[PDB]
Design a protein around this ligand. Structure first.
Ligand SMILES: [Ca+2]
Ligand SMILES: [Ca+2]
Ligand SMILES: [Ca+2]
Ligand SMILES: [Ca+2]
Ligand SMILES: [Ca+2]
Lengths: 322, 303
Protein backbone atom coordinates (compact mmCIF):
# COMPACT_ATOMS: atom_id res chain seq x y z
CA UNK A 1 0.00 0.00 0.00
CA UNK A 2 1.00 3.62 0.62
CA UNK A 3 2.83 2.14 3.62
CA UNK A 4 5.30 0.25 1.49
CA UNK A 5 6.15 3.02 -1.03
CA UNK A 6 8.29 4.77 1.59
CA UNK A 7 10.45 1.65 1.57
CA UNK A 8 10.60 1.43 -2.27
CA UNK A 9 12.58 2.72 -5.26
CA UNK A 10 10.97 4.73 -8.06
CA UNK A 11 10.79 1.64 -10.28
CA UNK A 12 9.28 -0.41 -7.47
CA UNK A 13 6.71 2.31 -6.72
CA UNK A 14 5.72 2.44 -10.41
CA UNK A 15 5.54 -1.34 -10.76
CA UNK A 16 3.23 -1.36 -7.76
CA UNK A 17 1.19 1.54 -9.15
CA UNK A 18 0.39 -0.24 -12.41
CA UNK A 19 0.23 -3.82 -11.10
CA UNK A 20 -3.19 -5.46 -10.70
CA UNK A 21 -2.60 -9.17 -9.85
CA UNK A 22 -1.70 -10.56 -6.44
CA UNK A 23 -1.02 -14.25 -5.85
CA UNK A 24 0.42 -15.48 -2.53
CA UNK A 25 1.57 -11.97 -1.71
CA UNK A 26 3.64 -11.53 -4.84
CA UNK A 27 2.33 -8.70 -7.02
CA UNK A 28 2.04 -8.85 -10.80
CA UNK A 29 1.45 -6.79 -13.88
CA UNK A 30 -0.75 -8.05 -16.69
CA UNK A 31 0.35 -7.50 -20.30
CA UNK A 32 -2.22 -4.69 -20.52
CA UNK A 33 -0.88 -3.22 -17.27
CA UNK A 34 2.59 -3.21 -18.79
CA UNK A 35 1.34 -1.54 -21.99
CA UNK A 36 -0.21 1.17 -19.83
CA UNK A 37 2.95 1.40 -17.69
CA UNK A 38 5.04 2.25 -20.75
CA UNK A 39 2.51 4.32 -22.76
CA UNK A 40 0.76 6.30 -20.00
CA UNK A 41 1.63 8.47 -16.98
CA UNK A 42 -0.67 7.21 -14.23
CA UNK A 43 -3.51 4.70 -14.15
CA UNK A 44 -6.98 6.13 -14.74
CA UNK A 45 -8.93 3.88 -12.35
CA UNK A 46 -7.76 2.91 -8.86
CA UNK A 47 -8.31 -0.85 -8.42
CA UNK A 48 -7.01 -5.32 -7.72
CA UNK A 49 -7.84 -9.01 -8.34
CA UNK A 50 -6.40 -11.74 -6.08
CA UNK A 51 -5.77 -15.23 -7.48
CA UNK A 52 -4.95 -18.63 -6.03
CA UNK A 53 -2.06 -20.51 -7.66
CA UNK A 54 -4.25 -22.71 -9.86
CA UNK A 55 -6.54 -20.02 -11.14
CA UNK A 56 -3.32 -18.26 -12.13
CA UNK A 57 -2.10 -21.39 -13.83
CA UNK A 58 -5.34 -21.68 -15.77
CA UNK A 59 -4.74 -18.04 -16.81
CA UNK A 60 -1.34 -19.18 -18.15
CA UNK A 61 -2.40 -22.50 -19.72
CA UNK A 62 -3.31 -20.53 -22.88
CA UNK A 63 0.03 -18.80 -23.43
CA UNK A 64 1.13 -18.80 -27.09
CA UNK A 65 4.43 -20.56 -27.72
CA UNK A 66 7.38 -18.49 -28.79
CA UNK A 67 6.81 -19.08 -32.46
CA UNK A 68 3.54 -17.24 -32.21
CA UNK A 69 5.31 -13.97 -31.36
CA UNK A 70 4.18 -10.81 -33.09
CA UNK A 71 4.10 -7.11 -32.41
CA UNK A 72 0.61 -7.95 -31.23
CA UNK A 73 1.58 -10.58 -28.66
CA UNK A 74 0.92 -8.30 -25.70
CA UNK A 75 -2.31 -6.88 -27.07
CA UNK A 76 -3.75 -10.28 -27.91
CA UNK A 77 -2.80 -11.39 -24.39
CA UNK A 78 -4.77 -8.53 -23.07
CA UNK A 79 -5.32 -9.30 -19.40
CA UNK A 80 -4.80 -13.05 -19.54
CA UNK A 81 -1.17 -13.11 -18.29
CA UNK A 82 1.21 -12.15 -15.48
CA UNK A 83 4.46 -10.18 -15.36
CA UNK A 84 6.68 -9.99 -12.27
CA UNK A 85 8.76 -7.01 -11.18
CA UNK A 86 12.04 -8.44 -12.54
CA UNK A 87 10.27 -9.35 -15.76
CA UNK A 88 8.99 -5.76 -15.93
CA UNK A 89 12.60 -4.56 -15.56
CA UNK A 90 13.66 -6.93 -18.36
CA UNK A 91 10.97 -5.53 -20.69
CA UNK A 92 11.85 -1.90 -19.87
CA UNK A 93 15.47 -2.67 -20.54
CA UNK A 94 14.58 -4.20 -23.95
CA UNK A 95 12.74 -1.02 -24.94
CA UNK A 96 16.03 0.95 -24.72
CA UNK A 97 18.39 -1.52 -26.44
CA UNK A 98 19.65 -1.06 -29.98
CA UNK A 99 19.29 -4.06 -32.23
CA UNK A 100 22.95 -5.08 -31.85
CA UNK A 101 22.31 -4.97 -28.13
CA UNK A 102 19.92 -7.91 -28.44
CA UNK A 103 23.01 -10.00 -29.12
CA UNK A 104 24.88 -8.48 -26.19
CA UNK A 105 21.84 -9.41 -24.05
CA UNK A 106 21.54 -12.99 -25.36
CA UNK A 107 25.24 -13.55 -24.71
CA UNK A 108 24.88 -12.06 -21.25
CA UNK A 109 22.28 -14.78 -20.64
CA UNK A 110 24.05 -17.81 -22.18
CA UNK A 111 26.35 -18.50 -19.24
CA UNK A 112 27.57 -21.77 -20.90
CA UNK A 113 27.94 -20.95 -24.58
CA UNK A 114 25.69 -23.60 -26.12
CA UNK A 115 23.78 -20.75 -27.88
CA UNK A 116 20.48 -21.56 -26.23
CA UNK A 117 19.05 -20.08 -23.03
CA UNK A 118 17.59 -22.50 -20.46
CA UNK A 119 14.73 -21.58 -18.20
CA UNK A 120 17.37 -21.84 -15.45
CA UNK A 121 19.75 -19.43 -17.17
CA UNK A 122 16.83 -17.06 -17.65
CA UNK A 123 15.91 -17.38 -13.96
CA UNK A 124 19.35 -16.59 -12.48
CA UNK A 125 18.79 -12.91 -12.73
CA UNK A 126 15.57 -12.88 -10.74
CA UNK A 127 17.66 -14.86 -8.26
CA UNK A 128 20.37 -12.16 -8.29
CA UNK A 129 18.14 -9.12 -7.80
CA UNK A 130 16.09 -10.87 -5.10
CA UNK A 131 19.17 -11.36 -2.89
CA UNK A 132 20.96 -8.07 -3.50
CA UNK A 133 18.50 -5.47 -2.19
CA UNK A 134 18.00 -7.36 1.05
CA UNK A 135 20.22 -5.44 3.42
CA UNK A 136 21.56 -7.16 6.52
CA UNK A 137 23.59 -3.93 7.03
CA UNK A 138 20.53 -1.64 7.33
CA UNK A 139 18.58 -2.11 10.55
CA UNK A 140 14.96 -1.33 11.33
CA UNK A 141 11.56 -1.99 9.70
CA UNK A 142 12.58 -5.53 8.76
CA UNK A 143 8.96 -6.74 8.63
CA UNK A 144 7.89 -4.02 6.21
CA UNK A 145 10.99 -4.50 4.06
CA UNK A 146 10.23 -8.23 4.03
CA UNK A 147 6.66 -7.50 2.94
CA UNK A 148 7.84 -5.33 0.06
CA UNK A 149 10.41 -7.99 -0.86
CA UNK A 150 7.62 -10.55 -0.95
CA UNK A 151 5.46 -8.25 -3.06
CA UNK A 152 8.27 -7.83 -5.60
CA UNK A 153 9.80 -11.37 -5.71
CA UNK A 154 7.72 -13.98 -3.85
CA UNK A 155 9.05 -16.84 -1.61
CA UNK A 156 10.74 -23.76 -8.05
CA UNK A 157 9.14 -20.36 -8.59
CA UNK A 158 5.79 -19.00 -9.75
CA UNK A 159 5.37 -19.45 -13.50
CA UNK A 160 4.76 -16.32 -15.54
CA UNK A 161 3.69 -15.42 -19.06
CA UNK A 162 7.22 -14.83 -20.35
CA UNK A 163 8.42 -17.98 -18.59
CA UNK A 164 5.77 -20.22 -20.25
CA UNK A 165 5.95 -18.36 -23.56
CA UNK A 166 9.76 -18.90 -23.67
CA UNK A 167 10.25 -22.37 -22.17
CA UNK A 168 6.83 -23.99 -22.41
CA UNK A 169 4.51 -25.31 -19.74
CA UNK A 170 7.01 -27.89 -18.49
CA UNK A 171 9.98 -25.49 -18.61
CA UNK A 172 12.16 -27.68 -20.83
CA UNK A 173 12.18 -25.71 -24.10
CA UNK A 174 15.19 -23.56 -25.01
CA UNK A 175 15.70 -20.19 -26.68
CA UNK A 176 18.12 -19.57 -29.55
CA UNK A 177 19.36 -16.11 -30.58
CA UNK A 178 16.85 -15.79 -33.41
CA UNK A 179 13.75 -16.13 -31.20
CA UNK A 180 15.27 -13.78 -28.59
CA UNK A 181 15.92 -11.16 -31.27
CA UNK A 182 12.41 -11.56 -32.59
CA UNK A 183 10.83 -11.11 -29.16
CA UNK A 184 12.74 -7.87 -28.50
CA UNK A 185 12.17 -6.55 -32.03
CA UNK A 186 8.45 -7.33 -31.77
CA UNK A 187 8.14 -5.67 -28.40
CA UNK A 188 9.86 -2.48 -29.54
CA UNK A 189 7.53 -2.47 -32.51
CA UNK A 190 4.45 -3.07 -30.32
CA UNK A 191 5.16 -0.23 -27.91
CA UNK A 192 5.91 2.09 -30.84
CA UNK A 193 2.65 1.08 -32.59
CA UNK A 194 0.56 1.69 -29.48
CA UNK A 195 2.01 5.16 -28.97
CA UNK A 196 1.68 6.16 -32.63
CA UNK A 197 -1.87 4.83 -32.90
CA UNK A 198 -2.65 6.54 -29.59
CA UNK A 199 -2.13 9.78 -31.49
CA UNK A 200 -3.03 9.11 -35.15
CA UNK A 201 -6.79 8.74 -34.63
CA UNK A 202 -7.05 6.56 -37.75
CA UNK A 203 -4.72 8.47 -40.08
CA UNK A 204 -1.36 7.57 -41.64
CA UNK A 205 0.22 10.54 -39.85
CA UNK A 206 0.54 12.04 -36.39
CA UNK A 207 0.91 15.80 -36.11
CA UNK A 208 4.37 17.26 -35.48
CA UNK A 209 3.02 18.91 -32.36
CA UNK A 210 2.20 15.40 -31.06
CA UNK A 211 5.55 14.15 -32.39
CA UNK A 212 7.44 16.75 -30.36
CA UNK A 213 5.14 16.15 -27.39
CA UNK A 214 6.12 12.45 -27.37
CA UNK A 215 9.77 13.50 -27.84
CA UNK A 216 9.80 15.51 -24.62
CA UNK A 217 9.74 12.31 -22.61
CA UNK A 218 13.24 11.65 -24.00
CA UNK A 219 14.58 15.14 -23.39
CA UNK A 220 15.89 17.23 -20.52
CA UNK A 221 13.73 20.14 -21.74
CA UNK A 222 13.93 22.73 -18.95
CA UNK A 223 10.53 24.29 -19.72
CA UNK A 224 8.27 21.78 -21.48
CA UNK A 225 5.57 24.29 -22.50
CA UNK A 226 7.98 26.79 -24.10
CA UNK A 227 9.36 24.05 -26.34
CA UNK A 228 5.92 22.92 -27.51
CA UNK A 229 5.06 26.57 -28.14
CA UNK A 230 8.24 26.59 -30.25
CA UNK A 231 7.13 23.69 -32.47
CA UNK A 232 3.59 25.05 -32.90
CA UNK A 233 4.89 28.42 -34.14
CA UNK A 234 8.04 27.19 -35.92
CA UNK A 235 5.97 24.83 -38.09
CA UNK A 236 2.84 26.74 -39.19
CA UNK A 237 1.79 23.90 -41.46
CA UNK A 238 1.54 20.36 -40.31
CA UNK A 239 2.40 17.76 -42.95
CA UNK A 240 2.40 14.83 -40.56
CA UNK A 241 4.77 12.04 -39.61
CA UNK A 242 4.23 8.55 -40.95
CA UNK A 243 4.69 5.44 -38.82
CA UNK A 244 7.82 4.47 -40.69
CA UNK A 245 9.36 7.86 -39.88
CA UNK A 246 8.32 7.69 -36.23
CA UNK A 247 9.87 4.20 -35.95
CA UNK A 248 12.96 5.42 -37.83
CA UNK A 249 13.45 8.15 -35.29
CA UNK A 250 13.12 5.99 -32.22
CA UNK A 251 15.43 3.28 -33.61
CA UNK A 252 17.87 6.15 -34.16
CA UNK A 253 17.39 7.29 -30.54
CA UNK A 254 18.43 3.88 -29.41
CA UNK A 255 21.55 4.15 -31.60
CA UNK A 256 22.36 7.62 -30.34
CA UNK A 257 25.85 6.64 -29.16
CA UNK A 258 26.99 5.55 -32.59
CA UNK A 259 25.62 8.87 -33.80
CA UNK A 260 27.76 10.79 -31.30
CA UNK A 261 30.85 8.92 -32.53
CA UNK A 262 29.97 9.87 -36.10
CA UNK A 263 29.60 13.59 -35.30
CA UNK A 264 32.57 13.66 -32.93
CA UNK A 265 34.65 15.68 -35.35
CA UNK A 266 31.91 18.32 -35.29
CA UNK A 267 31.83 18.44 -31.52
CA UNK A 268 35.62 18.77 -31.16
CA UNK A 269 35.31 21.88 -33.36
CA UNK A 270 32.18 23.35 -31.72
CA UNK A 271 30.37 23.40 -35.05
CA UNK A 272 26.76 22.76 -36.07
CA UNK A 273 25.61 20.26 -38.63
CA UNK A 274 23.24 21.03 -41.51
CA UNK A 275 20.24 18.93 -42.45
CA UNK A 276 21.94 17.23 -45.40
CA UNK A 277 24.93 15.84 -43.55
CA UNK A 278 22.72 15.38 -40.50
CA UNK A 279 20.74 12.91 -42.60
CA UNK A 280 23.92 11.40 -43.99
CA UNK A 281 25.45 11.04 -40.52
CA UNK A 282 22.28 9.27 -39.42
CA UNK A 283 22.61 6.84 -42.32
CA UNK A 284 26.32 6.03 -42.04
CA UNK A 285 26.16 5.70 -38.24
CA UNK A 286 22.85 3.86 -37.83
CA UNK A 287 21.94 2.46 -41.22
CA UNK A 288 18.56 4.19 -41.01
CA UNK A 289 17.30 6.38 -43.86
CA UNK A 290 15.48 9.45 -42.53
CA UNK A 291 13.05 11.19 -44.86
CA UNK A 292 13.89 14.84 -45.58
CA UNK A 293 10.57 15.60 -44.00
CA UNK A 294 11.65 13.87 -40.77
CA UNK A 295 15.01 15.64 -40.77
CA UNK A 296 13.40 18.99 -41.50
CA UNK A 297 10.91 18.41 -38.71
CA UNK A 298 13.62 17.50 -36.18
CA UNK A 299 15.47 20.68 -37.14
CA UNK A 300 12.41 22.90 -36.70
CA UNK A 301 11.72 21.24 -33.34
CA UNK A 302 15.26 21.53 -31.89
CA UNK A 303 17.02 24.34 -33.79
CA UNK A 304 16.41 27.09 -31.24
CA UNK A 305 19.17 29.35 -32.44
CA UNK A 306 17.22 29.29 -35.77
CA UNK A 307 20.26 28.86 -38.08
CA UNK A 308 18.82 25.77 -39.79
CA UNK A 309 21.72 23.88 -38.15
CA UNK A 310 22.05 21.79 -34.98
CA UNK A 311 24.77 22.21 -32.33
CA UNK A 312 25.94 19.59 -29.86
CA UNK A 313 23.66 20.62 -27.00
CA UNK A 314 20.70 21.49 -29.20
CA UNK A 315 20.23 17.79 -29.95
CA UNK A 316 22.73 15.22 -28.61
CA UNK A 317 23.43 16.91 -25.28
CA UNK A 318 19.71 17.35 -24.67
CA UNK A 319 18.80 13.65 -24.90
CA UNK A 320 18.65 11.78 -21.60
CA UNK A 321 20.35 8.39 -21.13
CA UNK A 322 18.00 6.32 -18.95
CA UNK B 1 39.21 31.04 -29.43
CA UNK B 2 37.85 27.67 -28.38
CA UNK B 3 39.80 25.80 -25.71
CA UNK B 4 41.17 23.50 -28.42
CA UNK B 5 42.42 26.41 -30.50
CA UNK B 6 44.21 28.02 -27.55
CA UNK B 7 45.94 24.73 -26.90
CA UNK B 8 46.89 24.22 -30.56
CA UNK B 9 48.48 27.67 -30.62
CA UNK B 10 50.28 27.14 -27.29
CA UNK B 11 51.87 23.82 -28.35
CA UNK B 12 52.38 24.74 -32.02
CA UNK B 13 55.91 25.43 -33.18
CA UNK B 14 56.00 26.07 -36.98
CA UNK B 15 54.89 29.05 -39.10
CA UNK B 16 54.58 28.89 -42.89
CA UNK B 17 52.62 31.55 -44.84
CA UNK B 18 51.17 32.86 -41.57
CA UNK B 19 49.74 29.30 -41.40
CA UNK B 20 50.62 27.44 -38.15
CA UNK B 21 51.45 23.80 -37.60
CA UNK B 22 52.43 21.26 -34.98
CA UNK B 23 55.25 18.81 -35.50
CA UNK B 24 54.54 15.17 -34.55
CA UNK B 25 56.54 15.68 -31.34
CA UNK B 26 54.44 18.76 -30.56
CA UNK B 27 51.37 16.55 -30.88
CA UNK B 28 52.93 13.92 -28.58
CA UNK B 29 53.43 16.69 -26.02
CA UNK B 30 49.97 18.18 -26.61
CA UNK B 31 48.48 14.76 -25.88
CA UNK B 32 50.76 13.62 -23.01
CA UNK B 33 51.59 16.76 -20.98
CA UNK B 34 50.08 20.00 -19.60
CA UNK B 35 52.21 22.81 -21.04
CA UNK B 36 55.34 23.24 -23.20
CA UNK B 37 58.73 23.81 -21.62
CA UNK B 38 60.21 26.48 -23.94
CA UNK B 39 61.88 27.29 -30.03
CA UNK B 40 59.91 28.44 -33.10
CA UNK B 41 60.86 28.06 -36.76
CA UNK B 42 59.60 29.55 -40.05
CA UNK B 43 59.67 27.49 -43.25
CA UNK B 44 59.28 28.41 -46.88
CA UNK B 45 56.81 26.37 -48.92
CA UNK B 46 59.59 24.31 -50.53
CA UNK B 47 61.70 23.57 -47.47
CA UNK B 48 58.38 22.49 -45.93
CA UNK B 49 57.78 20.36 -49.06
CA UNK B 50 61.19 18.62 -48.69
CA UNK B 51 60.72 18.22 -44.93
CA UNK B 52 57.55 16.47 -46.03
CA UNK B 53 59.25 14.56 -48.89
CA UNK B 54 60.86 12.50 -46.12
CA UNK B 55 57.43 11.16 -44.96
CA UNK B 56 57.04 7.34 -44.80
CA UNK B 57 54.41 5.62 -46.99
CA UNK B 58 51.26 4.08 -45.48
CA UNK B 59 52.78 0.61 -45.60
CA UNK B 60 55.58 1.72 -43.22
CA UNK B 61 53.11 2.72 -40.48
CA UNK B 62 53.90 1.55 -36.94
CA UNK B 63 53.26 2.29 -33.28
CA UNK B 64 56.39 4.45 -33.70
CA UNK B 65 55.43 6.62 -36.70
CA UNK B 66 55.07 9.82 -34.67
CA UNK B 67 58.27 9.41 -32.68
CA UNK B 68 60.52 8.48 -35.58
CA UNK B 69 59.06 11.50 -37.33
CA UNK B 70 60.05 13.50 -34.34
CA UNK B 71 60.11 17.04 -35.67
CA UNK B 72 60.24 16.43 -39.45
CA UNK B 73 56.47 16.65 -39.86
CA UNK B 74 53.51 18.97 -40.27
CA UNK B 75 50.06 18.92 -38.62
CA UNK B 76 47.41 21.61 -39.14
CA UNK B 77 44.69 22.62 -36.69
CA UNK B 78 42.13 20.43 -38.46
CA UNK B 79 44.50 17.48 -38.48
CA UNK B 80 45.10 18.09 -34.77
CA UNK B 81 41.34 17.79 -34.21
CA UNK B 82 41.26 14.67 -36.40
CA UNK B 83 43.95 12.97 -34.26
CA UNK B 84 42.26 13.88 -30.93
CA UNK B 85 39.08 12.33 -32.24
CA UNK B 86 41.07 9.28 -33.35
CA UNK B 87 42.37 8.91 -29.78
CA UNK B 88 38.84 8.65 -28.41
CA UNK B 89 37.11 6.38 -31.00
CA UNK B 90 36.56 2.67 -30.30
CA UNK B 91 37.66 0.25 -32.98
CA UNK B 92 34.09 -0.42 -34.12
CA UNK B 93 33.88 3.30 -34.87
CA UNK B 94 36.77 3.30 -37.38
CA UNK B 95 34.57 1.88 -40.12
CA UNK B 96 32.06 4.62 -39.39
CA UNK B 97 34.73 7.33 -39.63
CA UNK B 98 36.07 5.89 -42.90
CA UNK B 99 32.55 5.75 -44.34
CA UNK B 100 31.97 9.31 -43.17
CA UNK B 101 34.87 10.22 -45.49
CA UNK B 102 34.02 7.99 -48.51
CA UNK B 103 31.33 10.21 -50.04
CA UNK B 104 31.20 8.09 -53.21
CA UNK B 105 31.25 4.58 -51.76
CA UNK B 106 34.13 3.04 -53.77
CA UNK B 107 35.66 1.87 -50.39
CA UNK B 108 38.71 4.16 -50.81
CA UNK B 109 39.44 7.71 -49.64
CA UNK B 110 40.73 10.26 -52.15
CA UNK B 111 42.95 13.05 -50.99
CA UNK B 112 40.05 15.31 -51.92
CA UNK B 113 37.46 13.45 -49.86
CA UNK B 114 39.79 14.03 -46.91
CA UNK B 115 40.17 17.68 -47.73
CA UNK B 116 36.48 18.39 -48.42
CA UNK B 117 35.51 17.22 -44.96
CA UNK B 118 38.33 19.18 -43.35
CA UNK B 119 37.63 22.34 -45.32
CA UNK B 120 33.95 22.42 -44.33
CA UNK B 121 35.28 23.27 -40.83
CA UNK B 122 36.23 26.78 -42.03
CA UNK B 123 37.89 42.82 -34.47
CA UNK B 124 37.93 42.19 -38.23
CA UNK B 125 41.73 42.20 -38.55
CA UNK B 126 42.32 39.96 -35.52
CA UNK B 127 39.58 37.42 -36.30
CA UNK B 128 40.81 37.18 -39.91
CA UNK B 129 44.49 36.92 -38.85
CA UNK B 130 43.64 34.10 -36.44
CA UNK B 131 41.59 32.43 -39.20
CA UNK B 132 44.72 32.51 -41.43
CA UNK B 133 46.64 31.10 -38.47
CA UNK B 134 44.54 27.94 -38.19
CA UNK B 135 43.65 27.28 -41.83
CA UNK B 136 45.82 29.28 -44.23
CA UNK B 137 45.80 23.15 -49.75
CA UNK B 138 49.19 23.36 -48.00
CA UNK B 139 50.46 19.80 -47.89
CA UNK B 140 51.04 18.06 -44.56
CA UNK B 141 52.48 14.86 -43.15
CA UNK B 142 49.11 13.12 -43.07
CA UNK B 143 48.28 14.07 -46.65
CA UNK B 144 51.60 12.81 -47.99
CA UNK B 145 51.58 9.71 -45.78
CA UNK B 146 48.02 8.79 -46.79
CA UNK B 147 47.76 9.80 -50.45
CA UNK B 148 51.39 9.81 -51.63
CA UNK B 149 53.59 12.74 -52.58
CA UNK B 150 51.70 13.81 -55.64
CA UNK B 151 48.34 13.03 -54.14
CA UNK B 152 46.83 10.42 -56.40
CA UNK B 153 47.18 7.43 -54.13
CA UNK B 154 44.05 6.59 -52.21
CA UNK B 155 43.53 5.00 -48.86
CA UNK B 156 41.81 1.66 -48.32
CA UNK B 157 40.19 0.70 -45.05
CA UNK B 158 43.07 -1.62 -44.04
CA UNK B 159 45.59 1.23 -43.80
CA UNK B 160 43.05 3.65 -42.27
CA UNK B 161 42.28 1.13 -39.52
CA UNK B 162 45.94 0.45 -38.80
CA UNK B 163 46.82 4.13 -38.70
CA UNK B 164 44.25 4.92 -36.01
CA UNK B 165 45.04 1.72 -34.08
CA UNK B 166 48.74 2.46 -34.11
CA UNK B 167 48.16 6.05 -33.07
CA UNK B 168 46.10 4.91 -30.10
CA UNK B 169 48.89 2.47 -29.25
CA UNK B 170 51.66 5.07 -29.64
CA UNK B 171 50.02 7.52 -27.25
CA UNK B 172 49.31 4.76 -24.73
CA UNK B 173 52.94 3.51 -24.92
CA UNK B 174 54.31 7.00 -24.28
CA UNK B 175 52.15 7.51 -21.20
CA UNK B 176 52.89 4.04 -19.86
CA UNK B 177 56.63 4.52 -20.35
CA UNK B 178 56.42 7.97 -18.76
CA UNK B 179 55.51 6.06 -15.61
CA UNK B 180 57.14 2.62 -15.85
CA UNK B 181 60.69 3.96 -15.32
CA UNK B 182 62.13 1.07 -17.27
CA UNK B 183 60.08 -1.67 -15.61
CA UNK B 184 57.65 -4.18 -17.12
CA UNK B 185 54.76 -2.74 -15.08
CA UNK B 186 53.45 0.65 -13.95
CA UNK B 187 52.35 1.11 -10.34
CA UNK B 188 48.68 0.65 -9.39
CA UNK B 189 48.85 4.19 -8.00
CA UNK B 190 50.34 5.57 -11.24
CA UNK B 191 47.61 3.62 -13.02
CA UNK B 192 44.99 5.27 -10.81
CA UNK B 193 46.37 8.76 -11.44
CA UNK B 194 46.38 8.29 -15.19
CA UNK B 195 42.79 7.02 -14.95
CA UNK B 196 41.93 10.05 -12.89
CA UNK B 197 42.41 12.32 -15.87
CA UNK B 198 39.27 10.50 -17.23
CA UNK B 199 36.98 10.93 -14.21
CA UNK B 200 34.77 13.44 -12.42
CA UNK B 201 36.63 12.61 -9.18
CA UNK B 202 36.25 15.56 -6.83
CA UNK B 203 39.14 14.82 -4.41
CA UNK B 204 42.08 13.22 -6.22
CA UNK B 205 44.44 13.05 -3.23
CA UNK B 206 42.15 11.01 -0.99
CA UNK B 207 41.36 8.75 -3.94
CA UNK B 208 45.05 8.01 -4.57
CA UNK B 209 45.63 7.65 -0.84
CA UNK B 210 42.84 5.10 -0.93
CA UNK B 211 44.45 2.94 -3.61
CA UNK B 212 47.74 3.14 -1.70
CA UNK B 213 46.13 1.64 1.39
CA UNK B 214 43.80 -0.65 -0.57
CA UNK B 215 46.83 -2.10 -2.36
CA UNK B 216 49.59 -2.06 0.27
CA UNK B 217 51.35 -4.77 -1.65
CA UNK B 218 52.30 -3.73 -5.17
CA UNK B 219 52.12 -6.13 -8.12
CA UNK B 220 51.96 -3.75 -11.09
CA UNK B 221 49.85 -3.36 -14.20
CA UNK B 222 51.43 -4.51 -17.44
CA UNK B 223 51.14 -2.69 -20.74
CA UNK B 224 48.74 -5.28 -22.18
CA UNK B 225 46.53 -4.73 -19.15
CA UNK B 226 46.84 -0.96 -19.46
CA UNK B 227 46.00 -0.83 -23.20
CA UNK B 228 43.11 -3.27 -22.77
CA UNK B 229 41.65 -0.98 -20.09
CA UNK B 230 41.87 2.15 -22.19
CA UNK B 231 40.36 0.27 -25.12
CA UNK B 232 37.48 -0.64 -22.79
CA UNK B 233 36.99 3.02 -21.84
CA UNK B 234 36.33 3.96 -25.45
CA UNK B 235 33.68 1.20 -25.62
CA UNK B 236 31.89 2.17 -22.42
CA UNK B 237 28.49 2.52 -24.04
CA UNK B 238 28.43 -1.12 -25.12
CA UNK B 239 29.40 -1.83 -21.50
CA UNK B 240 26.48 0.16 -20.19
CA UNK B 241 24.20 -1.74 -22.59
CA UNK B 242 25.51 -5.01 -21.13
CA UNK B 243 24.89 -3.92 -17.53
CA UNK B 244 21.63 -2.11 -18.31
CA UNK B 245 19.50 -4.28 -16.12
CA UNK B 246 21.86 -3.95 -13.18
CA UNK B 247 21.39 -0.21 -13.61
CA UNK B 248 17.60 -0.55 -13.86
CA UNK B 249 17.54 -2.56 -10.64
CA UNK B 250 19.90 -0.31 -8.61
CA UNK B 251 22.32 -3.19 -8.19
CA UNK B 252 26.08 -3.68 -8.02
CA UNK B 253 28.27 -6.14 -9.99
CA UNK B 254 30.93 -8.34 -8.46
CA UNK B 255 34.30 -8.94 -10.08
CA UNK B 256 33.22 -12.11 -11.88
CA UNK B 257 30.10 -10.48 -13.29
CA UNK B 258 32.21 -7.42 -14.16
CA UNK B 259 34.89 -9.38 -16.00
CA UNK B 260 32.44 -11.44 -18.00
CA UNK B 261 30.38 -8.33 -18.79
CA UNK B 262 33.50 -6.69 -20.21
CA UNK B 263 34.01 -9.69 -22.45
CA UNK B 264 30.45 -9.98 -23.70
CA UNK B 265 30.19 -6.23 -24.20
CA UNK B 266 33.56 -5.40 -25.74
CA UNK B 267 35.25 -8.68 -26.54
CA UNK B 268 38.20 -7.75 -24.35
CA UNK B 269 39.53 -10.19 -21.78
CA UNK B 270 40.66 -8.52 -18.57
CA UNK B 271 43.15 -10.35 -16.39
CA UNK B 272 41.77 -11.06 -12.91
CA UNK B 273 44.56 -8.87 -11.59
CA UNK B 274 43.29 -6.03 -13.77
CA UNK B 275 39.71 -6.51 -12.54
CA UNK B 276 40.84 -6.74 -8.94
CA UNK B 277 42.84 -3.55 -9.41
CA UNK B 278 39.93 -1.62 -10.96
CA UNK B 279 37.81 -2.79 -8.04
CA UNK B 280 40.33 -1.74 -5.45
CA UNK B 281 40.69 1.67 -7.13
CA UNK B 282 36.96 2.30 -7.57
CA UNK B 283 35.11 0.01 -5.12
CA UNK B 284 34.96 2.63 -2.49
CA UNK B 285 32.01 1.26 -0.46
CA UNK B 286 34.42 -1.65 0.15
CA UNK B 287 31.68 -4.18 -0.59
CA UNK B 288 33.80 -5.86 -3.33
CA UNK B 289 31.10 -4.73 -5.73
CA UNK B 290 30.81 -1.81 -8.12
CA UNK B 291 27.68 0.30 -8.23
CA UNK B 292 26.68 2.55 -11.11
CA UNK B 293 27.86 5.68 -9.31
CA UNK B 294 31.29 4.19 -8.53
CA UNK B 295 32.42 3.31 -12.03
CA UNK B 296 30.22 4.08 -15.06
CA UNK B 297 28.73 7.21 -13.49
CA UNK B 298 32.21 8.46 -12.62
CA UNK B 299 33.58 8.41 -16.19
CA UNK B 300 33.58 11.56 -18.31
CA UNK B 301 32.05 11.56 -21.77
CA UNK B 302 35.41 12.25 -23.44
CA UNK B 303 35.15 15.93 -22.49
CA1 LIG C 1 22.66 -22.24 -22.34
CA1 LIG D 1 20.87 25.86 -34.79
CA1 LIG E 1 28.29 -1.15 -32.24
CA1 LIG F 1 36.18 7.38 -52.34
CA1 LIG G 1 30.94 -0.45 -3.85
Amino acid sequence: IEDLDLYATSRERRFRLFASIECEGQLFMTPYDFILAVTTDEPKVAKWKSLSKQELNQMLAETPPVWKGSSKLFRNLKEKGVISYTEYLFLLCILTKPHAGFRIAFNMFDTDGNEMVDKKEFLVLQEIFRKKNEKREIKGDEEKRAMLRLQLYGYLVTDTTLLVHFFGKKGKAELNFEDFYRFMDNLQTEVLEIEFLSYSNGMNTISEEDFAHILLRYTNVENTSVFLENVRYSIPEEKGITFDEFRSFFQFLNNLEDFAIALNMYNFASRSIGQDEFKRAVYVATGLKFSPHLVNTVFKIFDVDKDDQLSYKEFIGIMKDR
